[PDB]
Each structure stands twice: as C-alpha cells, then as structure tokens.
Design a protein around this ligand. Structure first.
Ligand SMILES: CC(C)(COP(=O)(O)OP(=O)(O)OC[C@H]1O[C@@H](n2cnc3c(N)ncnc32)[C@H](O)[C@@H]1OP(=O)(O)O)[C@H](O)C(=O)NCCC(=O)NCCS
Lengths: 296, 298
C-alpha cells in the first residue's frame, strides 16, 4: 500500500524539493495552493519511485496529480493504478500538460482518454511584461496605471506582513458582501482557501502586497514560486469602488517578484466571460492547457 | 513561537501518547475525530511545556482546547494567550469539563468567563449496560433487539474490513440522498468527516461493524478509544426502512469493544430533540458538559 500522507505546512521542503527543479508550471503545484485546498479534497501525497504524487477526493471522484519527477514513469503508473483499484475507482490523473500527455501515450498507447476544458487552462505572462508594461501591447495598461496615479496621487503600496493579515480578511469579506458574492458558485470554498493561506502566510512561504488609498486598504494580492522560473499569483482582491486598483496592485507586486521568475502564472478564467477577457487583456505568452487522463 | 502544525494521520502515536493516559473522556479528543474534522477547523497541534495543545478556527472564532498533560498549567496558558494575541483574537478555550473548570479557577481565579451549551454535552454510558442491556431500565431496548431477531433471524453482523469500506460508503451515499446532505450544513459537514474516516480507516486506528439483512448492508458504525477507559462511537448510520437496525448494530458493536473501556462515549445531541430523546433512552451514567472559557479582557 502506498503510504499516502495528509499534506501539511511541515511538508514544504519535501514538496518544493521536487517542484522547484521541475519544468512544471501548473499553478496547482504551488505549495500554498496544495495546502490551502486540502480542506476540500482531503489532499494527500507520497514519494513513489522518485516521483512526488498527489491524491485528491472531490466527492465521488478520485484523482491523482500527474507525477512530478524523473525516473520510471511506467512503474509509478502501475502503483497508482493498483491504488485506484484498492479504492474501487477508475484511475484518473489531473494537471497533465501537453508534454505529459505525450509521455503517457508512449507508455500505454491508446489506454488513456484525454479530456480538456479551456476553463481550467492557466494564463502565463512574462514577468518583464507585467513589471514594466512596455510596448504597444501594454499601452492601455500603462494608461490605467497613469490614470490611477493621477486620481489617487497619495496611494501607498506595502508588502503583506503577519501584522496586516486580519484586516485583509475582514476587508475581503466586506467587498464580497457588497458584490453579493454569496450567490456565486464556489465563493464559500474560495473563502476557506483564502483564510487558510492568510492565517499560515509565513509557514507557506507566500509574499504579497496591499494597496492603500486615502488611508484605507483597497486591494491585496499574494502568491509564491511554482518552480525555479515561474511565480504564481494566487489571489488578487480589490474594493470595486476604486477604479484601477486591480491594475495598480498587479503592477506594484510584479515589481516585487524576484527577477529569476521569468514567468508569472495568474491561474484560470473558469469559463467566466469577463474573467477570460481580463486575463487575455494582459497578453499571456502561454495559455497552459491541463488534461485529465483517465484509464480506458 | 508555538510551532503549531496541521494534524495528520502520521501523528497518531504522538497524540495518543498524551490522550490515552489522561482522564479526559470527551469525544473531541479521539484521534479519528481530530483528523476527520480538520477540514472544518483547520486543526493544528503542538507539544509545549509537556502538554498537548490544539488550535482550531471555528469560523471566525479562534479557539484552543484545554491543554492535555501534567505540568505548569499557568505557564502553558500564558503561552497560548500570547498566541491568541498574535492572532489578534481574545483567548478562548473549549472542552473545559466541570473538573477542568475547577482546576482553572484554582490557578487563575476570576480570569475566565465560563459559558456552556447543553447541545454540545457528550453522552457517556457503561459498556456493561450497552453490551448486555440487563435490568428493568433496558427492557424496551431488549424488546427492540428481540423483535429484530424475530423479524430478521438470519441477519449478519460483520466487522468493518478493507473490502467492506465501499458498502459503508454506499449506505452513507443513500442516507445523504434521503437526508439532503448536499444542502443541510450539519449533515454535509458530517459526511466530509465520515468519508475521511472511512478512506483512512486503518491509519486512524478505527474499528467498526456492519449489519446486513436479506443480502444488503442496512447499518454501519465505527469508533475508537478516547482514553484508557473510554471508547468513542463516532458514527452510526442505518437504512431507515429497517426497524430495529440502530438498536441491533449498537448492541453488536458494544460487544466488540474491548472490556478495558468501561465507558462508551456516543457524543452529542446537537440540541436536536429526536437525537436527545434517543441518547437519553439508552440511560447514560454521565452527561459530560463542555465549557467555553474566555479570558475576561486580557
Ligand atoms: C422536519 C422534521 C421531520 C425534522 O425531523 P426529521 O428529519 O424527521 O428528524 P431528525 O432531523 O431528528 O432525523 C433525521 C436523521 O438525521 C440524523 N441527524 C440529524 N442531524 C444530524 C447531525 N448533525 N449529524 C448526524 N446525524 C444527524 C438523525 O439521527 C436522523 O437519522 P435517521 O433518520 O437515520 O434515524 C420535523 O419532525 C417536523 O416536525 N417537521 C416540520 C417541522 C417544522 O415545521 N419545524 C418548525 C421549526 S421552528
């Protein structure tokens, strides 16, 4: 029996030892994302034949993350299929990128059914693009930040520190309530994941920023590295009454992301029309498809 | 500076080393309950100053359990208050039993406000009563068992084994369809805890039983020790169209609980009138009240 263990804060070194050196850019491999969503998926992990593997329960559905590492993929797949068999479920893997799909097909030709939903693709950008907003592609973004600067000349950006967390939580609840975000699917779950992240901010290895206008917090954002060259921005929330607050905090935080992080992953659009429009407006270099791969 | 960590399956030995030797009987100290409800409370623990301490987020309420162990209680409480200060919340402790409340008032007189909610009291029974149903006060219970045996003379009770986990999950799915766990907050939350327990049954240290009638599962139950002399029954579910199934599974499983567990803790009524009458009807020896102790100012 694979000795799957519940993921915890204390597993940060073990997990990032695999992910940081990997070529995997999927935001679901962020240590903060894995821990913060454990309440929903009863998330577990194991290291099997030099691969890091995650196991998730989503109601009736059992799924495993595409194994992270190098080594004998066939051997690890045999063990995961046996694990699914023990659970009396068909074997399904999530987070399979295009390269991973090719690797699976090579081991078990015709055995996997691959399904993809563009709602779940990640948007990846150049840090240099988001931090500088240089070039014609970013002209409107420059206009937004210049307009913000003109409207709110006394704004203040500060990094998130443990001392600033509870206010971020209180404010997030207030903003949601204004937009009646109760009545939007999934916001309760998103709130649980936000709370865990902010409560355990330092242990997780998150960094983040807060925007203030006229002496009050009006936006906050946080994230952490996904791999050696990709930083994930996991959350970005703002007081919707403040025009340009999203654009401004994006820009300020991008400039605090260490320069080794070539890429910034700002996650998925969830098939929401307005969100897809917003994420495409920042000119992603890659839209990172994620397949589910289920044994036939 | 308290190195709180998320509770996990792997922490079984660490936790139970403290709880088994303790005189704490409340069901919240079952290792299975601690892990299985983590999804709701983001539960963490630490050993500090020779005590085992737990930290929970009950929605907006930060809470700690009464420290488990022996040592300088005042020193450890000071550390927990400082932790609450860092969280920017008042310090409040849960599961303070009547005896633990007396201990607190001795070391720190008039420092705490104590509140109690009868909905959260645990029902504690003698294993000897539930396993035998002997005497006048258990006559109705014997009658239900006897009716069951007469109606279903070829029923089969089995322990929960790995190959039988799926039928328990199947019964739970049917029960939740009937009871609307998808929308009922309480039973939706119970479903999350029950399913975690079943999926991790052996790692947690749980034991359980299953009742079958006419070839299908009609009830299951599971639990594990809380301390050296108290066994906790965490879950009991039955197909409602089968009369006497709750009585029979209770009786069969009580007989499987090892004799060193003098007491059986069958948990709370949650202020639900039906559940309260059911739990009172089995004649508890103790209704274990649980206080919340909140620091008056600071
Ligand atoms: C609606 C009504 C039927 C609710 O009672 P009910 O669902 O029949 O009875 P309960 O909720 O006690 O029991 C339902 C089941 O869920 C269980 N249950 C309820 N809450 C639970 C919880 N938090 N955890 C685990 N089990 C729970 C009970 O044990 C019971 O199990 P069983 O059916 O397998 O024996 C009620 O009897 C009634 O009177 N109807 C109208 C009520 C009304 O108008 N209300 C005014 C309120 S002010």
């Amino acid at each position: 029996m694979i000795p799957f263990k519940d993921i915890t804060l204390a597993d940060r070194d073990t997990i990032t030892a695999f992910t940081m050196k990997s070529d995997r850019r999927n935001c679901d491999l962020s240590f903060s994302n894995l821990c913060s969503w454990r309440f929903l998926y009863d998330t577990q992990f194991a290291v099997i034949d030099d691969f890091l593997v995650f196991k998730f329960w989503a109601g009736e559905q059992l799924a495993y993350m595409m194994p992270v590492g190098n080594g004998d993929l066939k051997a690890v797949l045999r063990k995961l299929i046996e694990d699914a068999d023990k659970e009396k479920h068909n074997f399904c893997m999530l987070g399979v990128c295009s390269n991973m799909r090719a690797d699976l097909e090579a081991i078990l030709p015709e055995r996997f059914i691959f399904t993809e939903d563009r709602a779940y693709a990640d948007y990846i950008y150049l840090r240099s693009d988001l931090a500088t907003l240089k070039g014609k592609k970013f002209q409107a973004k420059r206009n937004h930040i210049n307009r913000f600067r003109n409207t709110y000349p006394d704004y203040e950006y500060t990094p998130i520190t443990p001392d600033r967390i509870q206010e971020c939580l209180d404010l997030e609840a207030e903003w949601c309530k204004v937009n009646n975000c109760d009545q939007q699917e999934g916001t309760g779950n998103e709130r649980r994941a936000l709370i865990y992240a902010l409560h355990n901010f330092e242990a997780l290895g998150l960094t983040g920023g807060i925007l203030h206008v006229n002496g009050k917090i009006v936006a906050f954002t946080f994230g952490m590295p996904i791999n050696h060259e990709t930083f994930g921005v996991h959350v970005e929330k703002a007081d919707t009454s403040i025009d340009g607050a999203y654009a401004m905090i994006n820009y300020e935080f991008a400039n605090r992301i260490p320069e080794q992080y070539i890429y910034i992953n700002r996650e998925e659009d969830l098939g929401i029309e307005g969100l897809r429009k917003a994420k495409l407006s920042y000119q992603p270099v890659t839209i990172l498809e994620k397949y589910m791969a289920c044994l036939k």
